[PDB]
Design a protein around this ligand. Sequence first.
Ligand SMILES: Nc1ncnc2c1ncn2[C@H]1CC[C@@H](COP(=O)(O)OP(=O)(O)OP(=O)(O)O)O1
Ligand SMILES: [Mg+2]
Length: 579
Amino acid sequence: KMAFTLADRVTEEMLADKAALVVEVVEENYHDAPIVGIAVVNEHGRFFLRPETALADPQFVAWLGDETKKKSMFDSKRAAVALKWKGIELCGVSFDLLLAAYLLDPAQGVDDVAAAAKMKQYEAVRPDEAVYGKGAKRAVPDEPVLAEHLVRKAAAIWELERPFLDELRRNEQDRLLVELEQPLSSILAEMEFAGVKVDTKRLEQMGKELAEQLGTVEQRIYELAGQEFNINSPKQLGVILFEKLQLPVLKKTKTGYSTSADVLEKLAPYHEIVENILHYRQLGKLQSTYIEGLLKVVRPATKKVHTIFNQALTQTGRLSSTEPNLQNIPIRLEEGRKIRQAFVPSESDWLIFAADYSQIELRVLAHIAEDDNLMEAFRRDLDIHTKTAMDIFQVSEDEVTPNMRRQAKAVNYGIVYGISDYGLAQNLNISRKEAAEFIERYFESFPGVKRYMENIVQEAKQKGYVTTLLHRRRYLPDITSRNFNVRSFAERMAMNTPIQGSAADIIKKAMIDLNARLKEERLQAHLLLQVHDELILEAPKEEMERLCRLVPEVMEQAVTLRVPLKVDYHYGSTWYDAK
DNA sequence: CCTGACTCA
DNA sequence: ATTTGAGTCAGG
Ligand SMILES: Nc1ncnc2c1ncn2[C@H]1CC[C@@H](COP(=O)(O)OP(=O)(O)OP(=O)(O)O)O1
Ligand SMILES: [Mg+2]
């Protein structure tokens, strides 16, 4: 039905200056993964190429790397990174169907061509899973079966480009795709392929010392409990706490007694064992995830870890980070924070540079809600987190520890994002009456915020979606539900999504501008990680003074708001020391 | 395989 | 009924 040529060799007509291109990587993690087949669809026809052939052809390599030869693809970052592991540079990607689908509706969770094709009732293509199988059954099919699939995906991208571009424009999301998400994709590809170097000697030594400590904590817990049990089993732990030790049951879930951190902290006046158990579970996560888990994914020859930043997953426009996640490395307790000493520069005499947006979503909220007191508070360069802390704990602006400031931060965001008196009371372990009062005195300080939250909920109910500064959209079909719980969740997404998502837009624009600046000044410095409202770089030590100016400036100037943007920054010999 | 732990923004 | 957005892990 769909004619295509199974080429034995690359020909001139395959190298047209506009094409839909498929460079197939079947493994979920595409770092150093096999390329199993290539497809090209253009004005001249439809082609399948064997990668052994095509990727060793100097004209095909040349075409891939030619910025003036425009390619339409699906998940171009996957291809770009797979090709870098093959030592080949991919340039000129002009359209990405994955990112196009993501912006049109992130709720669809589009993650193959067939799923994007369905958005426009295009059915002449199969889902990837149906072709390759799942779990232990996964496999590349016989060549003719593989070739047809790849070509059908290329044909889909080719015929779907205009319809998707048309709808993006209708939505005012065309520049968001072309000028923000697509250029970011290339930047993320660079970051992933660069990787972050790990000090495995230090990490392994930390692991040995941690094992000993876990043993000591473990034995003490058994002593306190009067028996041995699996502390890492919430079920067994529940029996010990609420049956053997007869402690009060504060919460249940569908599976049985809750042993959450929040519940165990509240049980501290009844038995010292709950504090030990909380310590044990913290240490155990360090070991399983940040020592053992991390060392499993280090590439042994280079000692580097290579994350994958998922650009088309979160419902608000944030990135996520997987295998390993490098956006949740410990920082909040000194015990876990020391993990960051194992993340080091990739060359000697280089350093790690880290920058963080100050009170980021509160600034954005001030701008969007146009609240008087809040907009003013940032012109006066106030720290609303610390002020809130002084108030909540009844202390002076010098008795506020970092932990206290962090706890205030969750209260400040909690409130603007819809926390109830019950939630706030449980969060700070205070009376609900007292909690209700903090909330009241909060919306009195910032009345425009309150209006904005009422107003954005009403709007969402009328339009059925909310939007960000750069025209990112989230649909919220549940917001007019007759069901209280379902409706309430959707209403809180309407409160949060425009703010978190606008803040995502900003740091994304900051990454693009920053790279442009790094290139024009021909610095060796380069981005390693993004952590939502943080950018981590490494660079020669001689570039630290110039970065101290360049990085914060670019980040602060990324957009222009009604309030200042403020960036904190540091550097040092390890990620830990960049504080 | 899911749930409830821990980790971050 | 009860802040938002994420990922990985051991246990079961
Ligand atoms: N508990 C929470 N609830 C909702 N959103 C939160 C959150 N914690 C963080 N976020 C969201 C909202 C904030 C944003 C960034 O996290 P930062 O810790 O960096 O908060 P920032 O306000 O920038 O504080 P600063 O840098 O001055 O210490 O992510
Ligand atoms: Mg911040």
